[PDB]
């Protein structure tokens, strides 16, 4: 099938809010084996973010109920968990087989390594006590590798660099229960960007400053 026709259908599926169709299109594009363009990379990410995000949101709701008949909720939670782990493993496989090894530019390597850190983080949120350490380790090493490259290659105001900080700081706070590391990473990222506002670009200055607002909002939550 021609790649450009699948990307056009992914953009119509996104407008229609049909994210499982969007994901199927972008996965078929990725599986052709050619490095994605930035636009294709962003479409594959939005599709999967929304697929997995629906299950994360239902999992949180059914967990809350189950904790507050209990058995029925446990099994429903387990069913949602199974779907969520399958979606994460889908993305993690694409990442390993196509996206990370094809990434020929630093910005895309940081984007993908950040994605691998996020999808391991979602698996960690639902992990068997026994598998949890390994999964947490894999999320942290993906984010650590993305972090070192972003620090080397990107300006402190670059939105991918700022989004990595935001998500890796939330990994520290929610998954490793390390709030001082979380706050320090978020504060440094915010401060290093304020120190270089002349680097903001007319293409991305609202994206950069929005993520900085989010870093400070989490700092506010965490210091309050």
């Amino acid at each position: 099938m021609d790649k450009n026709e699948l990307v056009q259908k992914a953009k119509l599926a996104e407008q229609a809010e049909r994210y499982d169709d969007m994901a199927a299109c972008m996965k078929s594009v990725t599986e052709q084996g050619a490095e994605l363009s930035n636009e294709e990379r962003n479409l594959l990410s939005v599709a999967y973010k929304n697929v997995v995000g629906a299950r994360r949101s239902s999992w949180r709701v059914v967990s809350s109920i189950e904790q507050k008949k209990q058995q029925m909720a446990r099994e429903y939670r387990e069913k949602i968990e199974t779907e969520l782990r399958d979606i994460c493993n889908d993305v993690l496989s694409l990442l390993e087989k196509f996206l990370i090894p094809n990434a020929s530019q630093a910005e895309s390597k940081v984007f993908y390594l950040k994605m691998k850190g996020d999808y391991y983080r979602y698996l960690a949120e639902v992990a068997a006590g026994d598998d949890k350490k390994g999964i947490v380790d894999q999320s942290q090493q993906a984010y650590q590798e993305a972090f070192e490259i972003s620090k080397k290659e990107m300006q402190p105001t670059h939105p991918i660099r700022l989004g990595l900080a935001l998500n890796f700081s939330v990994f520290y706070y929610e998954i490793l229960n390390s709030p001082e590391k979380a706050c320090s990473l978020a504060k440094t990222a915010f401060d290093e960007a304020i120190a270089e506002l002349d680097t903001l670009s007319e293409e991305s200055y609202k994206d950069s400053t929005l993520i900085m607002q989010l870093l400070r909002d989490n700092l506010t939550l965490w210091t309050s």
């Binding site: 939005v46 973010k49 984007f111 935001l166 998500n167 200055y205 609202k206 994206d207 993520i211 989010l214």
Partner: peptide, 14 residues
């Protein structure tokens, strides 16, 4: 000042 789809694609946490 927004890159097309980029903030949404970055699956921002929080």
């Amino acid at each position: 000042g927004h890159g097309q789809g980029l903030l949404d694609a970055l699956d921002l946490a929080s």
